[model samples]
Target: KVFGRCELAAAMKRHGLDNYRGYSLGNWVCAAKFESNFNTQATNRNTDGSTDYGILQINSRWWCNDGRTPGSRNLCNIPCSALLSSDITASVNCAKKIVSDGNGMNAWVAWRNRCKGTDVQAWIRGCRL
Candidate 1:
């Protein structure tokens, strides 16, 4: 399932991402826009034998274990498939763990590049959150 911009913002907030780990709702929504365009089933395989899964694009090399990435840390203690669900409960929980890992939202390069230190509020401007 692909989410609209405002729909994704509202859903993310309801899932406890708003201000989670000091990141604003806008920051999260912005990252989701660039990471996977709010697509629940999006995926991209890396050259290093790791794959990114779902909306937040959590990587198999460190976050979720896909049973393929060698030496996967599986830091989120979740299977990669869980992140691909449209329900997004597991995805939000894993993302919380990622942000809690001392790097904050910088764990996602897309956030760092597009949302960090920017006027992220625009990402949720029209949303009635």
Candidate 2:
């Protein structure tokens, strides 16, 4: 089954990212919306005949190159898929690792900052999922 707004919201909450920076829900939804239209089962095709899959649009080749197996790595092994399968918790966990592991939440923080200037802040703050 595909994920909807509520499922995405639940995923974010499970990841401990429910709070907004100052009055926003962060740019998570924007990212998801832009990346996969919030569809957990979304997938895209690559020119190499490989497949990119999931909401975050992680490339499966990246996972294979990184030495992760398909089933073991879940959707990570599928090119262009989210790092984790449709499992929002796993995806959020991976995102946290990627953000905090010396890189900081540069991408996420930047998105939030951008949204703060627009009415997007309200959308984020009021978003249910």
Candidate 3:
């Protein structure tokens, strides 16, 4: 599913991402914009030959099992395809793991370069949430 800004923010908040790990809703929303443009099916192949999956772009190497990545740790113990579902439950949960695992939002380079230290609140402005 492709989400509008408010809808995506609301969904993340519904999944307990508001102020999760000291990162605000805006932080998550902003990262998602850069990572996947709020599209659940987004995927990117990495230079290391692993792939990033879903809206949060959870890495196959460390989180989800893509099956193609022999280096997969599958820490989330979920199929990478699970992350691409429109439901977003698996993707959001895996993202929580990514944040809790000491990587924080820094796990996403898009977040580092685009969302980090910026006025992320703009990403969620005009939304009552």
Candidate 4:
């Protein structure tokens, strides 16, 4: 399902991401805007042939299992499809673990190319989080 940027922030905050793993809600929301536009079903195939799943667009290399990546750690142990759920509760939970494991939001290229070094106050400007 698609969520407006404000709604996305509220949801992300509801899911306890406003200050998760030392990252603010705006941080993730900024990355989400670039990654999937808050669409949970969003998926992309990386040039390396890895798949990015869910709102956070996590990769299969070290976070999820997609069969395309050989011997992936899949520390989350969840099928990549599971991350595609509209509810995104599962996806957020998995992402929390991914951040704690070491990637943080650095694992997502969208964050690097779009969110990093950019002011994110606007991402959550009108949201009541």
Candidate 5:
């Protein structure tokens, strides 16, 4: 079965950000570790009464319309099925397009340079991604 951490890593790798991208896989892992502790099921309720969900801590309510209700098709509004599908690589690719508006790999590149050489491990632990 596909789990969160593995799915997140697969997402990053499919975007071509794993090793060759400007950012290191370790750094991406660090971000995932920080953002959601690599937990795809994580959700956060904001003071503004908003909710975030999934491994990347995607703001499900806003981006994909996912909510607390069970069997909500809103959760399926985004490309989450890719994460749950047998072909995770294709899923990740789809997710990248959805999240970055066709500039998926560029988004990873931007993220990597933003946090490179900055005690990524510590950041990951601090953010609890």
Candidate 6:
């Protein structure tokens, strides 16, 4: 599920996450850059036996299920696969749920450590809407 950067901008804008949940698009783009490098099929194993899903690298522990994984809260009621496909609407919607879950973009450590208070205009510099 590879998407062009311009295509990503369009999708994020459509999902209302271009500037989402009190954060900017640069925030989302920066986080995505560090989390999965925009690879929608990205997956990673955590030491805790859980896995992350999709472009946003959402955790199966809270947001989605991979089917075989146990004890997933599945707060989004979406399969982890939903977060792994070319369609990112579900990922965007679930990410909003994550931001509202209390910690904001802090849910993504990448954003907190790397994007917060930093100049991120470069994330979307050339991929204008």
Q: Write down the RMSD of candidate 1 (Cα, Å).
A: 1.0
- Measured with C-alpha atoms, the lDDT of residue 65 in candidate 6 is 84
lDDT per residue for candidate 1 within 45-124, as digits (tens), equals 99899999999999999999999998878988889999999898999999999899888998899999988999999999
Window of ten residues with lowest summed lDDT in model 3: 64-73
Summarize candidate 4's per-residue lDDT along 8-63 as a digit string, tens digits. 88888888888898888889899888998888999998887788998889889878
Q: Highest TM-score, which number?
A: 3
Superposition TM-score, candidate 6 onto the true structure: 0.92
Cα lDDT tens digits for candidate 3, 1-129: 999999999999999999999999999999999999999999999999999999988899999898899856999989999999989889888888889988788998999999899999999999979
In candidate 2, residue 74 scores what lDDT? 31
Clashes per model (N, Cα, C within 3 A): 0, 11, 0, 0, 7, 0
In model 4, the runs with Cα more than 4 Å from the true position are: none
Best to worst by lDDT, what's the order?
A: 1, 3, 4, 6, 2, 5
- Evaluate residue 84 in candidate 3 and report its C-alpha lDDT on the 0 to 100 scale: 91
TM-score of each: 0.95, 0.54, 0.97, 0.91, 0.47, 0.92
Reference-based lDDT, each prediction:
0.92, 0.50, 0.92, 0.85, 0.47, 0.84
* Per-candidate RMSD, Å: 1.0, 6.0, 0.8, 1.4, 7.8, 1.3
Q: Measure candidate 5: CA RMSD.
A: 7.8
TM-score of 1: 0.95
| Model 1 spans with C-alpha error above 4 angstroms | none
3-84 per-residue lDDT for model 6 (tens digits): 6666676678778986666687878888888888888999998877779988889998898987766876899999888888
> In model 2, which regions exceed 4 Å deviation?
19-24, 46-51, 61-86, 101-119
